[PDB]
Amino acid sequence: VAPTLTARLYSLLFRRTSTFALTIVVGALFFERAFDQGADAIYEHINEGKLWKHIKHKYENK
């Protein structure tokens, strides 16, 4: 037997609230970045070539 993913997670990080906070601090960081990266991408896909990001080419450095 092994601990369910949760139980592993539990005994490594949540027993002590100090560890529990730490976790949350670090996940708040990591999560921001993926969310933004993913979420941004998603958005930018829906308006392909509509946004300057897509269009800076025309008048840029010749």
Partner: peptide, 22 residues
Amino acid sequence: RNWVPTAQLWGAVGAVGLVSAT
């Protein structure tokens, strides 16, 4: 006692919080 350990994780948290947050 357990305070050092706990104060150490509490110090960690504040640190990473500032660093990131700020």
